[PDB]
Design a protein around this ligand. Structure first.
Ligand SMILES: *[C@@H]1O[C@H](CO)[C@@H](O[C@@H]2O[C@H](CO)[C@@H](O)[C@H](O)[C@H]2NC(C)=O)[C@H](O)[C@H]1NC(C)=O
Ligand SMILES: *[C@@H]1O[C@H](CO)[C@@H](O[C@@H]2O[C@H](CO)[C@@H](O)[C@H](O)[C@H]2NC(C)=O)[C@H](O)[C@H]1NC(C)=O
Ligand SMILES: c1ccc(CNc2ncnc3[nH]cnc23)cc1
Ligand SMILES: c1ccc(CNc2ncnc3[nH]cnc23)cc1
Lengths: 540, 540
C-alpha cells in the first residue's frame, strides 16, 4: 500500500502504540510526529528568548569575577605598572555601565549555560508529560515568568533584592508547593482564591510588561528611552548618540555635582538622531515579518523573524552587527564560528541557595511564581484539554492529575538546572490542531529540543533587537484576555486596570498583582461588610 | 400646586420655553436645572485637573522671567555684592530643577490664568451649544487632549518642540479646520479615513497615558519613579528621599563626569523609603473615595475625592501640605486665604503665535488635535444623541450640524483664551440620564461654571496628589473601549496593541497614533495588493 501507512499500522499495533493509546485516540505515528514538529516550530523562539532574558539577569557570579582595571584604559592591567598608575579594585558598580570585562565574560558563559539549561528543562518536561501524563503538550521555560525572574526578582545584572541562587531556590520551593497542592487536590481552592478581575487581567498586565521589555535597549529594539521631564520618550537613536545618567545633588542656585556611589545607568538617554537607529529598524523589519507570519497562520512566525534579524546581524562590519569590533565581540564571533558545540552547564546547574528564605522579598517572589504558575497552568492545561476533546461532562480530562504533577516536576527540574519556572505552552495547541493526541507529540518536541542542543553557538549570538519583536508580539497575544473584563463595572474595571497598568509601570508582576488584589479587597470591603451584617441579621 | 409646578408651567408656555422646545421634549424647567446640576457635579473635576495639567506646560513665559540668582543661596540677589560674589544670568536650565523662583512665579500666575480660561471656555462652549444647537451637552477642555497639549506638544515647562503660543495657534487652526469640514459635511469621510483598530484603541491608549501621568511625581501621586536598569520602578518615597539625574560620560575604566549643559531632571529617583510618602497615601485615599463614589453611582465622585485630598493638604505644617514653608508656599497660602477673587487673564489670553506653522512638529500636533477631536466629538455627540432619544432611523439627531459647529467654535474660543481643545463631555450623559433634553441644561452648566469663577484661589491650591487619582480613574473609564477589538485577529490586534502601548511608553498620543496607523498600513499591504491585482484580473 504505502510505506508511511505500513509504519503507522506497525507502530499503532505495537506495545508502545498501545502504551500511548494511539488507536484509542485516532492517530498513530505520523500525525504525532507532525504535531510535534508543528509545536516545536511554533515554540522554537523560546530557545533564544529565554536564554537572552535570563542572561540579562547576570547569572550566578558576583563582583568576584570582575577583573581589576588600570587607571587609564590605554594600558592593559598586566602592564599597569608605572608612576601615578594603579589598579582599581572592582566594586558593585563593576556589574553596571561601564560593565567590567570580567562580568561580561560571566554573562556570556552564563548565557551559554542558560541556553543549555532551557533546552534540557524543556526536554525533560516534555518527556515527563509525554510519558507520565500521556498528553500532546510541550513544556518549556515560562515566557511570562522569564522576565519577572530576570528583571524583577533578580534584576538586571543582579540589581534586584534577591540573588540569582536565592531566586532559583524560590522557584524550586514553588515547584514543590505546586506539586504538593496538585497532589492533594487543593489547587482549585487557591485558583478560586484570586479575584476574578485580577486573574483575568494579570495575563494582559504581563503582556504589557513583556512588550515594554521589548521596547527597551538592553532588552529589545529600543524606541523607549529616558526623559528628564517625562521619564519615557521616543528612543531608537544610534548607540553613538545615547548617554548614561548619574544621581546628582541640586541646590538653590543651580550647582549640581555627582553623587558618590551613584548607580549609573546604561546608555538610555538619546541626545539626538531619534528614530535613526539601524538596529531599531532591523527589529522593526523582524516585527513585520513575524506579524505577517502570524496573520498568514504560518507556523514558526517568531522563529522566522528572529532568524532573519539574527542572520542580518551576523555580518561583522555593519551598524547592526552582533559581533562588534571589540574583545567581547571577537570572542562572541569566535564562539559563533563553530556552528555546533556540546556545551556543559558549569555555573547555573545546581546553583540553589536557601540563604534568603527569611527575607520577605524571597517569599514575595515565591508567591508570585506560585500563583502565576497555578492560574496559567490550570487555564492552559484545561484549554488544551478542551481543544483536544479530552474534557468530559464533569470537566476532567483523565490525565489532568499527572499533567499537573508533570508540570510541577518540570518546574523543580528547571530550577535545579538554573532556569525560571517551566510551564505548558499554549503553542501546544498547534500540535493539537495538527492531530496530536498522545504523548508521542511531547516526545517528538523533546527530540527536537535535543537537536536544539549542539547549536548553542548559533543561539548564543542573538542580539537584543532580535529578541525584541518576539517580546512585543507575545505581549500582543497575551493582551487578548482583556475582553473578559466587564469594563462597565468599576468594582471589576478598577482592579483589572490597576493590575494591567502596574506590571509595566512599576515594572514588576508581583507589584501589579498586589495592587490589583488590594484594590479589589478595598473596593469590596463595603459589600462584604454589608453582606456580613445581613447574615448576622442587622440588615434586611 | 407646588411652586415648582407653577414655575414649570410658566416657563414651558413662555417664549423662551418654546424657543428651547421644552414642551415638545417632555421637560420644562426643573428637569433642565437638575440635569445641569448633575452634569456640573460629574464634570467639576475639570476645573482643577485642566488647570493643573496646563500649568505644568509652563505657560507663555520663557527664561525672560527667570530672575538672576546669587552665587550662594544664603545671599539674596539684591545683596549679591562682594568679593568673589556674582549674579548668575538665567538660561534654559532655569526652567527646570532647580526651578528658578521667577519661573515658579510664572507658573503660579499662569495657573490662575488657566483656571479662569478653563472656566470661561467651558462657559462659552456650553452657552453656544445650548443656544445654537439646543442640546443638553456640556463642553469643557478636553481631558484627553489636555495632557497631550501640556506634556507632549509643549512639554513640561516648555521642554517640547513647540512653544505654548505656537501650540495655541495649532489648536486655533485645528478648530477652524474642524469647523470647516463639519460645515461642508466632509467630517464623516475623514472619520472613516482612520483604521478601525487604531480608532478603537486610541481611547484606551490615551487612558493609559493619563493613568501613567497620574502615577508620576510632578503630575500625580507618584508610585512610578526612575530606575537606572529598568527606567521605571516603585516610587512613592518621601520627597526628602528623592534625587535628580544628570547626563554623564562613561569610559573603559570607570570614570564618570557630568555633561555640561545637561538637562537635569526632577526629583524622580528614590534612594530609600519606598511606599512611605504620606502624599502617595493621601492620593490613594482620594483614589479610594472616588472609586467607591463611582461604584455607588454617586455623582461628583472625582470632585469629592479631589476636595477631600485638597482639604487635607490645605493644613500648613504637615508632610502633605499644599503650602510648604517657603516663599512660594507662603505666596500660595496668601492667595488661598482670600476665598474668592475675580482673576483676569493677563498672559494666556490672545497668546497665539503663528511662527511655527512651517515646522513639522506644529503640523503633527495640529493633525493629532484634529483627528482626536473628530473621532472623539463624533463618537460622544452621537452617543449622547442615542442616549437622549434624539436619533432617527437615518441616524441624524436634528441639531448635529450646529452641534459640531458649536464644538469647533468652542475649540477656537478656548484656543484664544489659552487652553487645550474643548470638547463635549461624556459626563453630559448624567444630565441626559436626569431628564435634560433641551439647551437649558447647557445654560445651567454654564451658570455653574460662571459660579466656578470667584473661587480661583481655592482651585489654584490643588496639589498633584489631588489631580492624581482623577487622572488614573479617567484612564480607567477610557479603557472600556478595548472590548471592541477582535484580539483574536492579529491583523487587527497588532495595530490596536501598538496604539495602546505607544501612547504611555513613548508618552505621546501622536506617536501612538502614527505607530498604530503605520502598523495597520504595513500589515494590509499584502491584502491591498492582492485585492488590487484581483480587481485588475491577474488573480481569481
Ligand atoms: C579613567 O580614564 C580617564 C581617561 O579618559 C581618566 O580621566 C581623567 O579625569 C578627567 C576625565 O578625562 C580629566 O580631567 C583627567 O585629565 C583625566 N586624566 C587623564 C590622565 O587623562 C580617569 O581619571 C580614569 N579613572 C580614574 C579613576 O582615574
Ligand atoms: C551654589 O551654592 C552652593 C552652596 O551649597 C555653593 O557651594 C558649593 O558646593 C559644592 C558642593 O555642593 C562644592 O563643590 C563647591 O566647592 C561649593 N562652592 C563654594 C564656593 O564653596 C556653590 O559654589 C554655588 N555654585 C555657584 C555656581 O554659585
Ligand atoms: C500569564 C500568562 C502566561 C504566562 C507565561 N506562561 C505561558 N503559558 C502558556 N503558554 C505560554 N507560552 C509562553 N509562555 C507561556 C504567565 C502568566
Ligand atoms: C479619546 C477619548 C477622549 C478624549 C477626551 N475628550 C473627551 N470626550 C468625551 N468626554 C470627555 N470627558 C473628558 N474628556 C472627554 C480624547 C480622545
Amino acid at each position: 500500500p504505502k510505506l508511511l501507512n505500513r509504519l503507522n499500522t506497525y507502530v499503532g499495533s505495537s506495545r508502545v502504540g498501545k502504551r500511548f493509546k494511539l488507536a484509542e485516540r485516532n492517530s498513530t505515528f505520523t500525525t504525532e510526529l507532525r504535531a510535534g514538529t508543528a509545536t516545536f516550530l511554533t515554540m522554537a523562539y523560546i530557545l533564544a528568548v529565554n536564554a537572552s532574558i535570563l542572561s540579562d539577569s547576570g547569572g550566578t557570579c558576583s563582583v568576584s569575577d570582575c577583573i581589576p582595571l588600570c587607571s587609564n584604559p590605554a594600558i592593559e592591567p598586566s602592564q599597569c605598572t608605572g608612576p601615578g598608575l594603579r589598579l582599581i579594585q572592582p566594586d558593585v558598580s563593576c556589574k553596571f555601565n561601564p560593565v567590567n570585562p570580567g562580568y561580561a565574560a560571566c554573562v556570556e558563559e552564563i548565557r551559554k549555560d542558560l541556553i543549555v539549561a532551557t533546552v534540557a528543562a524543556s526536554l525533560i518536561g516534555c518527556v515527563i508529560m509525554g510519558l507520565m501524563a500521556n498528553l500532546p503538550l510541550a513544556l518549556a521555560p515560562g515566557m511570562g515568568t522569564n522576565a519577572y525572574f530576570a528583571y524583577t526578582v533578580v534584576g538586571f545584572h543582579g540589581s534586584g533584592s534577591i540573588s540569582y541562587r536565592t531566586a532559583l531556590a524560590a522557584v524550586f520551593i514553588e515547584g514543590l508547593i505546586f506539586l504538593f497542592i496538585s497532589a492533594i487536590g487543593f489547587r482549585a481552592k487557591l485558583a478560586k482564591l484570586v479575584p476574578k478581575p485580577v486573574r483575568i487581567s494579570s495575563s494582559a498586565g504581563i503582556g504589557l510588561f513583556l512588550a515594554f521589555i521589548g521596547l527597551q535597549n538592553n532588552q529589545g529594539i529600543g524606541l523607549v528611552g529616558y526623559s528628564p521631564s517625562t521619564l519615557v520618550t521616543l528612543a531608537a537613536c544610534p548607540a553613538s548618540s545615547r548617554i548614561s545618567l548619574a544621581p546628582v545633588i541640586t541646590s538653590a542656585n543651580g550647582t549640581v555635582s555627582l553623587l558618590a556611589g551613584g548607580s549609573v545607568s546604561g546608555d538610555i538617554m538619546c541626545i539626538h538622531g531619534r528614530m535613526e537607529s539601524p538596529t531599531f529598524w532591523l527589529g522593526i523589519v523582524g516585527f513585520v515579518i513575524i506579524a505577517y507570519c502570524l496573520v498568514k497562520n504560518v507556523k514558526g512566525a517568531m522563529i522566522y523573524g528572529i532568524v532573519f534579524v539574527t542572520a542580518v546581524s551576523w555580518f561583522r562590519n555593519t551598524e547592526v552587527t552582533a559581533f562588534p569590533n571589540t574583545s567581547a565581540g571577537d570572542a562572541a564571533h569566535d564562539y559563533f564560528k563553530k556552528i555546533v558545540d556540546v556545551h556543559v552547564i558549569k555555573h547555573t546547574a545546581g546553583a540553589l541557595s536557601f540563604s534568603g528564605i527569611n527575607k520577605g522579598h524571597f517569599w514575595e517572589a515565591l508567591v508570585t511564581f506560585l500563583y502565576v504558575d497555578i492560574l496559567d497552568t490550570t487555564g492552559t492545561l484545561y484549554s488544551m484539554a478542551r481543544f483536544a476533546g479530552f474534557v468530559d461532562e464533569k470537566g476532567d480530562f483523565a490525565g489532568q492529575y499527572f499533567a499537573f504533577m508533570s508540570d510541577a516536576s518540570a518546574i523543580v527540574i528547571g530550577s535545579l538546572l538554573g532556569t525560571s519556572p517551566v510551564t505548558v505552552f499554549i503553542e501546544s495547541s498547534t500540535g493539537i490542531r495538527e492531530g496530536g493526541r498522545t504523548g508521542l507529540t511531547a516526545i517528538t518536541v523533546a527530540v527536537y529540543f535535543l537537536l536544539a542542543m549542539f547549536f548553542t553557538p548559533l543561539l548564543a549570538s542573538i542580539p537584543a533587537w532580535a529578541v525584541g519583536p518576539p517580546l512585543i508580539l507575545v505581549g500582543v497575544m497575551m493582551m487578548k484576555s482583556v475582553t473578559e473584563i466587564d469594563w462597565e463595572d468599576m468594582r471589576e474595571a478598577i482592579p483589572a486596570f490597576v493590575t494591567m497598568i502596574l506590571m509595566p509601570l512599576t515594572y514588576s508582576v508581583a507589584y501589579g498583582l498586589i495592587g490589583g488584589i488590594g484594590s479589589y479587597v478595598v473596593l469590596h470591603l463595603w459589600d462584604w461588610g454589608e453582606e456580613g451584617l445581613v447574615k448576622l441579621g442587622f440588615l434586611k
